[PDB]
Symmetry: D2
Subunit: 121 residues, 4 copies
């Protein structure tokens, strides 16, 4: 739990996530995607449970990435919510929501949902 979150992670699509977990619950780093209207790294900020477990539970966390950087602006943001599980093969299992900024007319179709699993391999 805790510390172990810090590092570089990868998901099934090939995106790379580099985070630093601060002693008091903060998550900071950058996200470089593999899919979408994304081009380079984007900043990410999140929060995690700095005091999880002690039944074998994972550490709840979440983070956001607005898809705007110096090269692209997709006018969308993705939030990932999930939990970290350490061990010989640590992983972060997540479900995410991607909302695009639409006009009212298209508001009903503004959010996509998916799931991503990150490993350090």
């Amino acid at each position: 739990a805790e510390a172990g979150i810090t590092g570089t992670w990868y998901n099934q699509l090939g995106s790379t996530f580099i985070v630093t977990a601060g002693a008091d619950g903060a998550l900071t780093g950058t996200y470089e995607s593999a899919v979408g209207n994304a081009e380079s790294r984007y900043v990410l900020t999140g929060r995690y449970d700095s005091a999880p477990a002690t039944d074998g539970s994972g550490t709840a966390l979440g983070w956001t990435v607005a898809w705007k950087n110096n090269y692209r602006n997709a006018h969308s943001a993705t939030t990932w919510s999930g939990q970290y599980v350490g061990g010989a093969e640590a992983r972060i299992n997540t479900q995410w929501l991607l909302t695009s900024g639409t006009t009212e007319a298209n508001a009903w179709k503004s959010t996509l949902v998916g799931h991503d699993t990150f490993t350090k391999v």
Copy 2:
């Protein structure tokens, strides 16, 4: 626009969201929830599009709150994903995911999903 988002907002459950949108696309503030095993204010951090479209499109944003503060720890975290819509009655419409830490065994039932609409007070 940072300015339109900065403020105090409330949702249909009676929770309070105090946020500051920074120039670099950052969102920081505190959240006071009306439901859950929550007690006091919790810190929030998020991001938004500081350069949205010039179209009456909303401004996409998102934020996270881990439900642990000096008084309580619920071992869970919620992320809200949605868009800010300004005008005379500005709203932030979101969909959220609340994940609880669990054992591998109960992981299938670790995430709740819902939706909240926030109204700005000013």
Copy 3:
């Protein structure tokens, strides 16, 4: 209760839902959507709890509509999951998932999520 669910309902987008709750927990009917690449009525099939709690709890139910009829085919399907709440103003509050057929490549962006509230007309 089958009876309270049977009827014509409308949601905030202007779509029509005509359903019949059968005694065995089945839901059949048609859906007329206001949005999407939809044209005419589409068939729906679902299930509900024919024996809910005796608690002012809602009655859980869910249904599916594949967006293909004799006039149009959108290669997508939506499932709504929610509960029926009876009273003077009966509502069915749902959360939905709309999945489109895609190539492995775009599969990550194949599902949309939202929420609809239906009001019964009678």
Copy 4:
């Protein structure tokens, strides 16, 4: 596409899904779970695109299971939305919503979301 959906499928949790896909878009069969307040088989009903693709796309489908049978009544229902992909290893990739019937007070926490992948192995 089409036909290939008919059969017995299994997901990662061990639940078994037995469906029949009808020529015009119907899905009928039974679901026997591995998790929850479930006990035996439950009836399922759904719909699928009987005319998908012709770019290599999967077949969109969805189905519902109300968790009430002659032995248990969990006062909940689950809907799975996803697409079928055939081939040497056919699979159905889904995201699901599980709603329990609550009082208004707990309505905010009535729906769980997850994802399941079914294979015939």
